[model samples]
Target: LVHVASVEKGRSYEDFQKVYNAIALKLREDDEYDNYIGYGPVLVRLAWHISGTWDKHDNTGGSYGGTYRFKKEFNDPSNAGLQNGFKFLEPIHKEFPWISSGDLFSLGGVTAVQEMQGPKIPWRCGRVDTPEDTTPDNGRLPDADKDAGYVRTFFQRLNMNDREVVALMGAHALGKTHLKNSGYEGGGANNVFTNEFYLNLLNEDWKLEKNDANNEQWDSKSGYMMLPTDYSLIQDPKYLSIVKEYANDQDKFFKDFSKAFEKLLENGITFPKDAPSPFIFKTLEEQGL
Candidate 1:
């Protein structure tokens, strides 16, 4: 059950940079998706859903396996609306067929965050595609209807602590939750990555109301929303402390989120001492592309 890092034969940083460029350029070119929110958010969500399947104890399901290409993982109820991200990567995968699904998926997230003006996520390229049997069963992802305790307990399987959980949830700043996709909806969807989720959680005048799906979500007059799980950050004092810290300090939030997210994506995989240092990719704007 030991899944060691294995770089694609003869590939290096430059090769992965090309893959990153392709994903970044495509994200720019395809600007009409999801009411002009574009593909950035979904791509990040895709990367997270794929990696979030990992269970630290058994190390059975993780981005290391890349089993999301299998039908069961692709069709997971927890993974609805991610097909857009998969389809978005279709051409990139064909263009660079050597890249493993896990690497591409995870790296797509890194590229999306950087392109969207988020923190730079240091990424390693070595996730190998495992057999379909390695795919984790559905329901491994967290539920939106839950509370702080449920969120804490759920992340324990992934070995994430309180700050990590709070930092990672900052990703909710991107993309809206679709009623069709996850039985939740709306959040002033924007592709830009920032500490806005924390700001909104702390500053917004929110009302707990039932959505069309009959689930209660915190809504604001500004047309943004917070899932029960999202609102739970403030309900518990420990989590609320982290949330307030992130809300006040943008730099700290970005740094913490970068670390937490990389750890989230790297869960359940063992990287060798000889493995290359993680790559910090340049944003498309940085390259003047």
Candidate 2:
């Protein structure tokens, strides 16, 4: 059975704040990664990968378990290129060995978003470690090479609705889809982070181009890339409206993204409303301590 521990009763806001600071410091120290694009984007992706394993009905896998430290889970094919993220966190893990892997991983996502000027994701800590055999099967993540309908259907298994799907994809604005990482390339030019994904959707005249690597996707004159599924946001009438809304207004995108991302990270866990409003920890630079 899943044993849900109560929040650390003696722990105050200050306690978690210190943990947040630790993560923030590591994020700053590791800023040289991914061509100095920083570890923020991939850290966010790591949190998503860990939490994304949850099957709502069974409550089998999620951020609450902290199970990705296991060899089997670490070897997941869908997790290609994530070892860099883990390696980035190794020092942090060694420094603060008291924090559970699940908490550290999930907190990494929270820290990344807050530091990146994205959102203040509230977090709770109670994830215990599990064994290697507990890892979920492969193919749980969404495929970039598909269509809007497929995207919609895939999220249904995760219990996400339309708005959530669009909000999550906004993360594409942060990291490029590396050809080495995901068999596609040039989505974001070598880690130039912005709301550019939406802008690219509106501003560019995209043509369907097949790369020499044998993948057929759309390419733009400016050398940006879009997956078949990303293109479907415009081609399909339903997704187009939301895509355009985000493209036109930065505030709207941020608001919807904050809500949807919080929802995405909290997918399988049930929490009481009175527990605690999510804490918005300050970035290391913001603290200046």
Candidate 3:
């Protein structure tokens, strides 16, 4: 089924800006979650996971359906720990009930990224919810227990290139993996949105260690880890080139990430050419918050 953009009537940039403020304010208040890493990172992850299900082959999965609210996608083992993001958005949903579930879900990710001072992820609304039957089956998202080849191929289903894949994974800088959640653990500066993931990758003396989750992850004495999939960036020459570029120049990473993420969230949905240009939201810093 094809989903086309149909933004909420009479809603303009201000309407979405209001929603952004609500999400941004809540992010500032919700410091207790994730050990002060806050909801920003997970919210972005929730956004990615929601949109990550897209299969460019048939266009069957993506954020356009917002099926994650349904039992099938909610209960997806791959979606573990994402409930926090949904719950975090509930009040905002209540406050702005007119927004579509898919729009809210995707917008949450955009808001979190900008508020965290990561990048300007231009977002567009207009994702109407479909029935429970529309939810895709589990196992669509990538697995951490994989190699560079697997990671590359998995992202191909979502239509992301090597640079985009590496840029998107830069989000790992913001959140830690729970042993029980993704069978990996470790990330630092868990709040700020920076290229620290690349910095850590380039500088950290990571040692392969088996965690309590029985997963092999690279750990450093500073107490952060890199999943095999993440480590794959440096393992593969093509990906390694981009990784080095991002690690050395944060502005480049931020710019590239902004574009890749906007594309990620918009996958599988068609927007008419007449639709308004993507909205570049002002961050809290820009808003003088």
Candidate 4:
């Protein structure tokens, strides 16, 4: 199960940057999605869903294998709302057919975070598509209904430490959960990336209540919501410390998130000793586009 880095047929930074720009441009144009929350959050979730399948024990499912395009992975109940992100990436993939599906999917997240004013995630493109039979079975993604113990143990399978898990969960700040999609619902519904997830976690006065789906979630008077897994960060003493750190320091949160996210996307793949350095893409605003 050695998935080596194979840069697509001599494609380099400029080419992928073009793909990044195309995705970013569409992200800007398709402004009506999710009632104007835009595609940012879903794209980030898509990347995580695709990459999170990796099991370090055996190195089976991961971003190195672009198997999510397969029916089994695409129809995963855990991935209910991600079709929107895939559809959003459809045109960009068609236009840049040279890019592998894993690369495109992972890069979409990178492009999305940067375009939405998040930290710059250094990306390397080399995920080759594996066969349909290689797609990981469903139920690999974490359950939202669990508590602090489950949250810590689940992320351990993905090799994420407390800081990485808390940092990555900051992505929760960008999008709201849809009840139809994941049996969870409600957040302020924002598209801008920020440390606000942590802020809301600490500042909001949340009470536990069951939604229409009969799943318990913490709800605040301000109309924001938190999954049991989300609220667990504060319940657990160790996770609470990191949560507080991220809540207070935006720069440190951004920096840790950028590193942890890149590591998440790159899991289960081997880069050659001579592989090119990871590319730090310029956002559309940075390029004045």
The RMSD of every model to the true structure, in order and in angstroms, is 0.7, 2.2, 1.1, 0.6
Candidate 1 lDDT by residue in tens digits, 169-271 = 9999998989989898899769999999999999999999999989899999989899999999999999999999999999999999999999988988899
Please tell me which model should have the higher lDDT, number 1 or number 3.
1
Q: Per-residue lDDT of 1-289 in model 4, one digit per residue for the tens?
A: 7999999998989999999999999999999998988999999999999999999999999999899999999999999989999999999999999999999999999999999999999999889999999999999999988889998999999999999999999999988989999898899779889999999999999999999999999999999999999999999999999999999999999999999999999999999998889999999998999
Clashing pairs in 3: none
Query: Which model is ahead, 3 or 4, in terms of TM-score?
Result: 4
**TM values, all candidates:** 0.99, 0.91, 0.97, 0.99
State which candidate has the highest lDDT: 4
Of the pair 1 and 4, which is ahead by lDDT?
4
Cand. 3 TM to true fold:
0.97
Instruction: Report lDDT per candidate.
Output: 0.93, 0.76, 0.89, 0.94
Tens digits of lDDT, candidate 2, 1-289? 4546345555656777787787777777767777777888888899989988877678777777677888777888778888888887788888767777887888888788778777566677656676777777776777878999999887776778887787778787776667777777776533433466778887999999877667878998887888999888888887888888888887888878777776666666666556566766777767786
Question: How high is the lDDT of residue 134 in model 4?
Answer: 92
**lDDT score of model 4?**
0.94
How do the residues 180-217 of candidate 3 rate in per-residue lDDT, one tens digit apiece? 77777666547778998898888989898898877898
Flag the better candidate by lDDT, 2 or 4: 4
What ranges in model 1 sit over 4 Å off?
A: none
Q: Candidate 2: global Cα-lDDT?
A: 0.76
